[PDB]
């Protein structure tokens, strides 16, 4: 479940995308906590989360949107070690794809 950030002006900010199989999915901003954010930033060697950004701030994505939520405790070294749960009833639009600004 490898992460990446895209559309930022520097590598440690952007829209969140996480790989599953040979495709990448975006993450709805109803579904991504500060602790999930912290694990992602750590995983990419970007320090820790400063901010979550909603409403397709770095632009909306296309394609798949993750159907499970990453229910991270906060100290996991990878998103793949985080517990997982279904997202609430329904699908999101890409207009609600989440982003982050990580900092050291």
From Swiss-Prot:
Disulfide bonds join 28-92, 41-102, 72-82. It comes from the Eukaryota. Residues 3-103 form the SRCR domain. A soluble form (sCD163) is produced by proteolytic shedding which can be induced by lipopolysaccharide, phorbol ester and Fc region of immunoglobulin gamma. This cleavage is dependent on protein kinase C and tyrosine kinases and can be blocked by protease inhibitors. The shedding is inhibited by the tissue inhibitor of metalloproteinase TIMP3, and thus probably induced by membrane-bound metalloproteinases ADAMs. Expressed in monocytes and macrophages. Detected only in one population of monocytes (CD163+) which is in advanced maturation stage. Induction: Suppressed when monocytes are differentiated towards dendritic cells by CSF1 and IL4. It is found in: Cell membrane. Interacts with CSNK2B. Involved in clearance and endocytosis of hemoglobin/haptoglobin complexes by macrophages and may thereby protect tissues from free hemoglobin-mediated oxidative damage. May play a role in the uptake and recycling of iron, via endocytosis of hemoglobin/haptoglobin and subsequent breakdown of heme. Binds hemoglobin/haptoglobin complexes in a calcium-dependent and pH-dependent manner. Induces a cascade of intracellular signals that involves tyrosine kinase-dependent calcium mobilization, inositol triphosphate production and secretion of IL6 and CSF1. The SRCR domain 3 mediates calcium-sensitive interaction with hemoglobin/haptoglobin complexes. This is Scavenger receptor cysteine-rich type 1 protein M130. It comes from Sus scrofa. The gene is CD163. The chain holds residues 477 to 577 of 1115 of the full protein.
